[PDB]
Design a protein that fits this description.
Length: about 120
């Protein structure tokens, strides 16, 4: 049945899944803040990645009630992953670290989504 989710319900359910990503070391570090192409020396980045996303931005959106439904949060986490797999070479640390975060996220999000429905 279709359903209305309160901002605090989503925060309580979903913030632990986000913290599970932030706990990963070494893999979470490049995902903690928005990519800064100038600092990183990669001026092509915003030419390739049209809709940047990162953990800090997702955390803020959860804290400020910007998700109405859990799939919107899942979509942002996957936008972050897809951006990293699009831009980075397959041998790079960021690409392989992304793959690890996707494994962790898949494990954490499943029982939480069952709980929200
Ligand atoms: C999603 C994404 C993220 C990055 C990205 C973001 C932050 C990074 N900080 C570092 C270093 C730099 C100097 O010392 C501290 C770590 N790197 C370099 C890689 O280091 C690491 F592998 F350990 F993370 C950063 C990279 C870059 N692109 C292109 C992204 O797509």
């Amino acid at each position: 049945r279709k359903k209305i989710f309160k901002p605090e319900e989503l925060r309580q359910a979903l913030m632990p899944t986000l913290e599970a990503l932030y706990r990963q070391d070494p893999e979470s570090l490049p995902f903690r803040q928005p990519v800064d192409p100038q600092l990183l020396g990669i001026p092509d980045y915003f030419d390739i990645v049209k809709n940047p996303m990162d953990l800090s931005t997702i955390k803020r959106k959860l804290d400020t009630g910007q998700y109405q439904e859990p799939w919107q949060y899942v979509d942002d986490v996957w936008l972050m992953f897809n951006n990293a797999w699009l831009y980075n070479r397959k041998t790079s640390r960021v690409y392989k670290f992304c793959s690890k975060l996707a494994e962790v996220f898949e494990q954490e999000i499943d029982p939480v989504m069952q709980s929200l429905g």
